[PDB]
Write a protein that binds this ligand. Structure first.
Ligand code: CL
Ligand code: NA
Ligand code: ZN
Length: 695
């Protein structure tokens, strides 16, 4: 009670979202008031509409922007600060929000004005960015069913409504399943082989479930399914029965009982196919491809090319594991299973390259990783990044906030970073999200542009007691990856808000700058700038750097095949699979797996039930987007190799070109063209193969 509706934080004008003052109780009133105001604005827009920027595109952006920013902030809070009250609130307003998105998207007065712009006799004189914007709006309106008669339209809107609901449900079941599993270890024997770091984590966990005397050394241990817990078990637990139990629990998350995602998946695929037919396509993959660089055929070709290049290496990887385990006298070497792979891969990796993950950890502290990352961004792209904590409200005390400046000391962008695993309330994985776009229209009166703001979110090993977060090499690459996305959002030079940043970039190109950044983790100057012992300040020894380098291509065939399995199963489920029939999604999984993994999945494998990328994310008939863009990213990196990675002048010159093409142009130019503008030619898959030793 107590406060006026008009004082609701979601309804105020703000520079940075009020992330510290918004909670579940604000959502129904704020969102319902907002939608009433936006309906009225849309009516005014339709009434005055003309095929010009001031009468069409500017008032449209003002409507889309407000919805995107406010809904975006609520969805962000659901992903990092989930509560039952926030879920119920979002579920109660989500249909009204979707209804409004459909109303807006299906506006005939807006659509007809965009067609009149496209049909103008001097179209060729309109700027490329504005051409891209108009073409995108026309194509998007058709994809949201504007061409359908009123009865088919009704059916389309009902499908859209149900898909939004199922996707939210899918992600809640995954969070809930990951949260639910807790394994209390009391007998020190069962945990044999877990390193100190993991021990320190499962004991810190132990405390907050009761058992308050618990220590790393001795006191009891709770094992969970979030990655920083699950992975060390699979890499290190000498107890094979514990590996098998943790594996089977991980593999069956959200696949039975109240959290089952199976029927949700079945319903999602059914509806996706109905939608495709309403729009005149054969299957949903064709719908997905309408907005992508690829076609189903071209995507399939690339996957099959990479698969062919990876297969013999993957077979040899399996034989190498068997040989190694057998030479250790391990009884399971005669019948290696999925719960042995990670474990023996890590033993092999240790023996073959003489590197121990646990001993590397002191050299990879988050504060030093961030310092080195920012120093690299300065070198490549000319920007200065500094902490600005206090400037923007945040949702948790671990959240960092930074200001990005150009060479003259002028702010050009900001970002938040929420770095640590928090499985009680925070979605798994790692991602980047937009907060606000760079926009001329949304600028304050008297200033030329609203500066862009991004989110970076990771789920890395938390700090243990008082020390900083100590990371694995994989966690470092993940930070670089998400930073790559943030840079494309933040460094954009488009002021046309609807094509700025990452907007309107064909989805199979959005993984270009993120994967590109990961290459620099192996660049000597970059790695050495980061790798300072957290207590001691001593730089990582040269010979250790050399072993890290040698280990880069370890099991590249198997890692490649794993990604190709994910991409192929996605494509297959959205092309040939017909839901409702005798064949289950798990049968599809088995069939596709015959050519994309060296041994079959267990019959009890339910990895699909956690595959949020394609059931609660932007990658439906799109998971291949990672590999498609990795070809581009690898080849982009080879431009630096060509120029000379040992020549700081050449590195800065090439970096500036990258900054002024891939990072600057947003979706205001076709991605193949932006790439050619940077590279000097069309892309080749040779760099990607060479980098991973798969030529
Ligand atoms: Cl309509
Ligand atoms: Na396409
Ligand atoms: Zn990414």
């Amino acid at each position: 009670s107590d406060e006026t509706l008009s004082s609701n934080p979601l309804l105020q004008d703000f520079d940075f979202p009020p992330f510290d003052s918004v909670d579940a109780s604000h959502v129904r009133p704020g969102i319902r008031a907002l939608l009433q105001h936006l309906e009225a604005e849309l009516e005014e827009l339709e009434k005055s509409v003309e095929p010009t920027w001031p009468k069409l595109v500017e008032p449209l952006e003002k409507i889309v922007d407000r919805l995107t920013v406010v809904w975006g902030m609520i969805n962000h809070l659901k992903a990092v600060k989930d509560t039952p009250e926030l879920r119920a609130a979002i579920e109660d307003v989500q249909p009204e929000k979707v209804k409004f998105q459909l109303r807006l998207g299906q506006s005939k007065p807006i659509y007809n004005a965009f067609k009149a712009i496209r049909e103008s006799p001097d179209w060729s004189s309109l700027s490329e960015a504005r051409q891209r914007l108009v073409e995108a709006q026309i194509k998007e309106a058709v994809l949201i069913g504007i061409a359908l008669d009123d009865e088919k339209r009704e059916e389309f809107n009902k499908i859209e409504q149900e898909l939004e609901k199922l996707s939210h449900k899918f992600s809640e079941n995954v969070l809930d399943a990951t949260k639910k599993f807790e394994k209390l270890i009391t007998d020190k024997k069962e945990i044999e082989g877990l390193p100190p770091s993991a021990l320190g984590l499962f004991a810190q966990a132990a405390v907050s479930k009761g058992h308050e005397n618990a220590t790393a050394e001795n006191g009891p241990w709770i094992i969970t399914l979030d990655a920083p817990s699950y992975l060390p078990v699979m890499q290190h637990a000498k107890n094979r029965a514990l590996r098998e139990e943790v594996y089977r629990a991980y593999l069956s998350r959200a696949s039975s009982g109240d959290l089952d995602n199976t029927a949700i998946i079945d319903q999602i695929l059914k509806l996706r196919l109905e939608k495709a037919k309403l729009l005149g396509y054969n299957n949903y993959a064709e719908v997905s491809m309408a907005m992508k660089m690829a076609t189903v055929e071209k995507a399939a070709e690339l996957l099959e090319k990479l698969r062919s290049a990876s297969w013999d290496a993957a077979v040899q990887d399996m034989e190498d594991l068997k040989s190694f385990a057998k030479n250790q006298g391990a009884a399971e070497s005669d019948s290696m299973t999925h719960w042995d792979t990670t474990f023996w891969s890590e033993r092999l990796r240790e023996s073959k390259y003489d590197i121990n993950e646990e001993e590397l950890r002191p050299y990879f502290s988050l504060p030093k990783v961030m310092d080195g990352l920012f120093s690299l961004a300065k070198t490549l792209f000319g920007i200065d990044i500094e902490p600005a904590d206090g400037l923007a409200p945040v949702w948790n005390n671990d959240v960092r906030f930074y200001r990005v400046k150009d060479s003259s000391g002028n702010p050009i962008a900001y970002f938040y970073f929420d770095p640590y695993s928090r499985p009680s309330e925070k979605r798994g994985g790692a991602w980047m999200d937009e907060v606000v776009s760079r926009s001329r229209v949304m600028a304050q009166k008297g200033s030329s542009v609203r500066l862009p703001v991004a989110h970076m979110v990771c789920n890395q090993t938390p700090p243990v007691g008082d020390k900083p977060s100590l990371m694995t090499f994989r966690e470092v690459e993940t930070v670089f990856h998400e930073f790559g996305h943030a840079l494309q959002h933040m460094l954009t030079k488009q002021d046309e808000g609807l094509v700025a940043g990452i907007r309107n970039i064909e989805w199979d190109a959005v993984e270009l700058p993120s994967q590109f950044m990961e290459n620099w983790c192996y660049h000597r100057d970059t790695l050495m700038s980061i790798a300072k012992h957290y207590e001691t300040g001593e730089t990582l020894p040269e010979e250790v750097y050399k072993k890290l380098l040698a280990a880069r291509t370890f099991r590249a065939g198997s890692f490649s095949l794993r990604q190709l399995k994910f991409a192929s199963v996605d494509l297959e489920l959205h092309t040939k699979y017909v839901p409702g029939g005798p064949e289950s999604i798990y049968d599809v999984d088995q069939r596709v797996s015959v050519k994309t993994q060296v041994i079959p999945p267990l019959p009890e494998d339910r990895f699909l039930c956690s595959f949020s990328h394609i059931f609660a994310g932007g990658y439906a008939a799109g998971y291949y987007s990672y590999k498609w863009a990795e070809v581009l990213s690898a080849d982009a990196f080879s431009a630096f190799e060509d120029a000379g990675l040992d020549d700081i002048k050449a590195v800065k010159e090439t970096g500036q070109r990258f900054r002024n093409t891939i990072l600057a142009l947003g979706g205001g130019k076709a991605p193949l063209k932006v790439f050619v503008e940077f590279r000097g030619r069309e892309p080749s898959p040779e760099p990607l193969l060479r980098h991973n030793g798969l030529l």
